[PDB]
Amino acid sequence: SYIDLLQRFRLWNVSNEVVKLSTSRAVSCLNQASTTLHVNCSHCKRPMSSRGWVCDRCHRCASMCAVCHHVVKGLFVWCQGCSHGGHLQHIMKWLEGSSHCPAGCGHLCEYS
Amino acid sequence: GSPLDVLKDERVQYWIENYRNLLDAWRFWHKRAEFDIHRSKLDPSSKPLAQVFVSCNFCGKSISYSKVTSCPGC
Amino acid sequence: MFVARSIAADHKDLIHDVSFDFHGRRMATCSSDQSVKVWDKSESGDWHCTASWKTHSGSVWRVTWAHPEFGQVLASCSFDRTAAVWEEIVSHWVKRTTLVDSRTSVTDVKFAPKHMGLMLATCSADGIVRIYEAPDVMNLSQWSLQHEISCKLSCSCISWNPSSSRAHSPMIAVGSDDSSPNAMAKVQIFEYNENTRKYAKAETLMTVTDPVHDIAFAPNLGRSFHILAIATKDVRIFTLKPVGPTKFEIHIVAQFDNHNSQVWRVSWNITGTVLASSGDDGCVRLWKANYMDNWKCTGILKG
Ligand SMILES: [Zn+2]
Ligand SMILES: [Zn+2]
Ligand SMILES: [Zn+2]
Ligand SMILES: [Zn+2]
Ligand SMILES: [Zn+2]
């Protein structure tokens, strides 16, 4: 009841905090079902291992930032149209000054 | 506006890549993207960066490019 | 055209080597008490300290950086026949590997250009030059030995060839400091052979027949040749032109004497047009090219 009432008012931080420290297993197992993403290397089209940033066959790093050109080991933002992205706070700042994919593929990533 | 025959000479590409690396070293990162846009508009021979993509759990295919929410394949 | 200033940095001993990183925001210095320090810049412009730790058994000669696409990696070479690799975990640097294949004192260590992976070449005082690799970039505790080169002299400095074009094979150059009263050449260049997968001697500068304390290559930036710099009782600049190992047309373009001492170190800049030199007179001099492609002194700074 508490979780539903919190979700009505759109307070996800408190709802997830409650789910994390819940005393019952059924509630604790709510944000664990189907929250895992599978990512693949677009040069070789092969699945990537669960922990690492270097491809197994191409021997190339694939989590390259499209703005700062460093290796992304943490949070990664992604565009579903042209399949490009980078650091969470780099693309966010780039996209409030321009309307082009920073990798330069002629895409208007927000369609505006 | 050079022809596609001379842009394929492996001496212009070396110069372009060296300039891009110089721009990277000085930490001029928005200028490099600005240059990349104007270079991809004119010269279409070179492909952009290659990165990761997200794949469906039941097919194995890519979800890149009819509910907006469901996989385009299955 | 250059103006000097002092930098607020407290040291208790005498500094042996100074090095920079790719962007120019960190530096590493090694001192006489076998300590290495890592200095970080700031937005204001001041330098602060981040680490300090004793490393080796004997004296520490060198310290060098690595490209940031591999992490934060440092390499040091010392008098007790070893070279070590350090990595930053956040901030306390830890040890990863110790190369013990040597039987005499290591004099120089250098990391390889990026496009060949993560590679590292060392050189000793017995006449051996060795090359290591790391087939996994996420496991820096596992290294391998791939090549050995016998020089039949006493090595004192090495340098790689920065060029990354598809038409240049990997290159390396080795100097000698032997004072043997003879007329042997003291700088030779080794080149990779893609067929037999070995290293082979390609050229030998027969005009340098005196002690050599340092050599250095210069960045390509898309030129048609290679530029080399030597540090002997005088400063010289050579050029190599491409024409079994390939053949070169070695010329000479500069021979300066304005130190009246023995020059110790030579280092280039990011573009490869200005040169720095340090002699045994306590001054640092800078050289440049001119409109007539004639090398002329630019500035003189007294330490
Ligand atoms: Zn791959
Ligand atoms: Zn970034
Ligand atoms: Zn794109
Ligand atoms: Zn897009
Ligand atoms: Zn599917």
Side-chain angles (χ1 to χ4, degrees), chain A residues 1-3 5-24 26-28 30-45 47-49 52-55 58-112, chain B residues 1 3 6-7 9 11-44 46 48-60 62-64 66-74, chain C residues 3-9 11 14-16 18-30 33-42 45 47-77 79-100 104-107 109-123 125 127-132 134-135 137-140 143-151 153-162 164-165 167-175 179 181 183 185-193 195-196 198-202 204-205 207-209 211-246 248 250-260 262-279 281-282 284-289 295 297-301 303:
Chain A
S1 307
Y2 195 26
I3 295 295
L5 250 187
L6 274 179
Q7 288 178 335
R8 287 219 188 211
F9 283 99
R10 236 190 285 257
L11 304 154
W12 319 99
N13 286 337
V14 192
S15 164
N16 204 73
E17 210 34 89
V18 170
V19 171
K20 221 160 187 284
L21 330 178
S22 100
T23 319
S24 184
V27 193
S28 303
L30 262 188
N31 58 20
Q32 277 188 0
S34 160
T35 49
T36 290
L37 278 85
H38 291 343
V39 291
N40 291 10
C41 160
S42 58
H43 194 274
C44 66
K45 274 93 181 153
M48 272 195 58
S49 151
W53 65 91
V54 161
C55 191
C58 308
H59 292 289
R60 66 187 295 101
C61 79
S63 55
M64 211 56 217
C65 184
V67 176
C68 86
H69 269 308
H70 268 72
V71 195
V72 171
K73 286 191 227 291
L75 292 184
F76 192 96
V77 84
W78 194 66
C79 157
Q80 214 194 29
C82 60
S83 158
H84 292 137
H87 282 114
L88 182 50
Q89 313 214 210
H90 283 166
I91 307 304
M92 180 202 202
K93 274 213 298 330
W94 167 260
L95 278 183
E96 76 172 32
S98 148
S99 84
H100 280 279
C101 177
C105 62
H107 188 228
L108 269 73
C109 282
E110 304 197 22
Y111 287 121
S112 163
Chain B
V6 317
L7 281 189
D9 197 19
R11 269 178 307 186
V12 184
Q13 318 272 46
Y14 201 21
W15 295 328
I16 302 177
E17 291 311 336
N18 276 317
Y19 183 42
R20 261 157 45 93
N21 176 44
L22 260 181
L23 271 182
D24 263 348
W26 299 319
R27 274 151 62 240
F28 283 10
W29 289 326
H30 286 214
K31 314 280 188 31
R32 184 194 44 75
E34 265 307 310
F35 175 85
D36 277 352
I37 282 172
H38 157 280
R39 177 265 192 98
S40 279
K41 181 154 320 297
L42 271 37
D43 161 14
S46 82
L49 215 35
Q51 281 163 292
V52 290
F53 71 83
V54 189
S55 60
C56 170
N57 222 27
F58 309 99
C59 318
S62 156
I63 74 185
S64 188
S66 308
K67 255 194 228 184
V68 168
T69 290
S70 38
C71 168
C74 50
Chain C
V3 317
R5 314 141 291 271
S6 190
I7 271 290
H11 280 99
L14 310 164
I15 309 185
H16 285 330
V18 195
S19 185
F20 261 103
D21 85 312
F22 176 61
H23 293 281
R25 324 290 281 162
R26 335 282 295 287
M27 64 169 80
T29 36
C30 88
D33 47 295
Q34 305 142 88
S35 39
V36 296
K37 305 172 151 23
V38 178
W39 289 77
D40 273 28
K41 214 195 198 35
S42 81
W47 295 85
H48 303 342
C49 202
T50 303
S52 268
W53 70 99
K54 315 282 211 143
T55 56
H56 279 268
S57 310
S59 322
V60 189
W61 307 123
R62 288 281 183 60
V63 75
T64 173
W65 275 88
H67 199 274
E69 173 278 309
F70 301 118
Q72 307 274 309
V73 169
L74 281 199
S76 60
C77 81
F79 184 61
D80 49 316
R81 289 79 95 82
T82 87
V85 192
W86 310 88
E87 155 147 296
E88 161 170 323
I89 276 149
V90 303
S91 68
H92 65 124
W93 304 64
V94 309
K95 244 212 205 168
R96 294 291 181 201
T97 308
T98 294
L99 311 143
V100 312
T104 324
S105 90
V106 187
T107 66
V109 79
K110 272 313 161 51
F111 265 118
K114 215 173 51 173
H115 63 288
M116 311 155 288
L118 172 79
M119 270 183 102
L120 171 133
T122 83
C123 90
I128 305 331
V129 170
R130 304 151 171 140
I131 278 160
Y132 300 88
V137 192
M138 291 146 258
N139 205 310
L140 284 91
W143 291 74
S144 317
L145 191 142
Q146 310 229 336
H147 306 62
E148 265 201 28
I149 290 169
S150 274
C151 305
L153 253 169
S154 89
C155 312
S156 287
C157 52
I158 66 197
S159 203
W160 279 96
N161 190 3
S164 83
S165 202
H168 296 350
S169 298
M171 254 187 35
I172 205 144
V174 178
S179 179
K186 313 218 181 325
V187 160
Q188 39 267 41
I189 303 202
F190 295 89
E191 185 185 351
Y192 193 66
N193 204 236
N195 288 342
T196 173
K198 314 292 291 323
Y199 272 93
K201 174 186 290 301
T204 177
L205 273 44
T207 181
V208 173
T209 86
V212 173
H213 305 275
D214 166 88
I215 66 172
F217 269 87
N220 229 15
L221 263 176
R223 286 186 251 270
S224 43
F225 45 87
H226 317 282
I227 291 126
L228 197 48
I230 314 282
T232 166
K233 65 202 91 63
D234 52 333
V235 174
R236 336 199 174 179
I237 296 167
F238 286 78
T239 68
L240 289 104
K241 215 148 311 308
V243 165
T246 180
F248 299 99
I250 290 150
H251 283 123
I252 177 155
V253 278
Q255 176 142 49
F256 303 1
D257 159 1
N258 309 10
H259 273 292
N260 304 324
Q262 292 256 16
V263 61
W264 259 55
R265 306 296 222 234
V266 201
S267 153
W268 292 94
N269 70 334
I270 200 180
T271 286
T273 77
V274 194
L275 199 49
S277 76
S278 163
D281 87 5
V284 163
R285 283 170 220 260
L286 305 184
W287 323 95
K288 273 198 40 182
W295 293 87
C297 199
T298 295
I300 308 194
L301 321 173

